[PDB]
Amino acid sequence: MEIDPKDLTFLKELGTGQFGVVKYGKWRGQYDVAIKMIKEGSMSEDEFIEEAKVMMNLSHEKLVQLYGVCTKQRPIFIITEYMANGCLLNYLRERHRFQTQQLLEMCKDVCEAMEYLESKQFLHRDLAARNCLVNDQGVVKVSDFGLSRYVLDDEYTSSVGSKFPVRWSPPEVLMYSKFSSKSDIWAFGVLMWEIYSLGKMPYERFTNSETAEHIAQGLRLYRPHLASEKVYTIMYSCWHEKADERPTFKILLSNILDVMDE
Numbered sequence: 277m278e279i280d281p282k283d284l285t286f287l288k289e290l291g292t293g294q295f296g297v298v299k300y301g302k303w304r305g306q307y308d309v310a311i312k313m314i315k316e317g318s319m320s321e322d323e324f325i326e327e328a329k330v331m332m333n334l335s336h337e338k339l340v341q342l343y344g345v346c347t348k349q350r351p352i353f354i355i356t357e358y359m360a361n362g363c364l365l366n367y368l369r370e371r372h373r374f375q376t377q378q379l380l381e382m383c384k385d386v387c388e389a390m391e392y393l394e395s396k397q398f399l400h401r402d403l404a405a406r407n408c409l410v411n412d413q414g415v416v417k418v419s420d421f422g423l424s425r426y427v428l429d430d431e432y433t434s435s436v437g438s439k440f441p442v443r444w445s446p447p448e449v450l451m452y453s454k455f456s457s458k459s460d461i462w463a464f465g466v467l468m469w470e471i472y473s474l475g476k477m478p479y480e481r482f483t484n485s486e487t488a489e490h491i492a493q494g495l496r497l498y499r500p501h502l503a504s505e506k507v508y509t510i511m512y513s514c515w516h517e518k519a520d521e522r523p524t525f526k527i528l529l530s531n532i533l534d535v536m537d538e
């Protein structure tokens with residue numbers, strides 16, 4: 277869907293990300309939207325355009341909904357559902373006095389979105405709490421799934437670059453740049469750890485380079501105080517050295533529902 281830019285009103289600046297400025301606005305006068313304004317040189321634009329229809333067909337309650345794009349102009353606009361509470365990481369760190377039931381509910385929200393993406397054989401490639409958003413009701417939804425592919429920035433795309441998500445990557449991504457549904461599984465386990473530690477930085481006080489080395493040897497994130505033994509077993513299963521020994525999102529989602537019922 278090609279949104280006519282005359283149907284958008286720009287109301288507030290939401291901040292800056294990898295692709296530049298993001299604004300809050302209204303679409304067709306009534307619908308609350310976030311609008312990414314793609315800065316010149318930051319994206320592989322023609323590749324993104326010739327695949328944006330697939331991304332629009334991605335529709336799930338726990339996925340930030342893509343409403344449309346403005347591609348007959350520069351900057352390109354990406355118009356999505358608005359999430360009033362911003363990113364999950366900053367949200368975890370904030371007054372909320374979270375209960376363990378709420379922490380699992382957040383894991384479930386993310387897992388449902390990821391099981392849906394897995395069912396469509398679509399990789400997120402940068403799953404982390406900083407890339408999940410929270411709405412006015414405290415519902416967590418995953419955002420910017422598949423956009424990692426289109427980043428034009430060597431510090432981000434190189435596994436040894438300063439911006440590469442090393443702390444959310446499995447050994448086969450760090451050593452061989454081998455992305456799969458199993459590399460998103462690993463990132464999900466790290467995200468579960470971010471949630472249960474209330475937004476702590478994974479492998480705190482260690483650099484990306486030391487993290488890459490330690491993970492390859494077998495170091496794993498400690499069990500957070502707020503994680504039960506059952507919850508830790510689930511996030512730990514995501515970090516198997518062998519990608520084929522890691523569960524699928526179907527299994528994780530089923531395991532999370534089982535813990536919830538217990």
Ligand SMILES: Cc1c(NC(=O)c2ccc(C(C)(C)C)cc2)cccc1-c1nc(Nc2ccc(C(=O)N3CCOCC3)cc2)c2[nH]cnc2n1
Nearest residue numbers: 290291292293294298310357358359360361362402423424
């Ligand atoms: C996502 C994003 C980025 N990042 C990128 O664009 C990006 C990320 C990753 C990559 C890859 C490819 C590298 C992976 C590429 C690009 C930067 C800025 C905003 C947003 C953003 N913010 C939203 N809502 C907010 C935000 C803030 C506040 C606020 O001010 N608050 C919070 C509450 O307390 C008070 C203060 C309230 C609501 C959205 N709602 C729907 N979409 C939204 N997008």
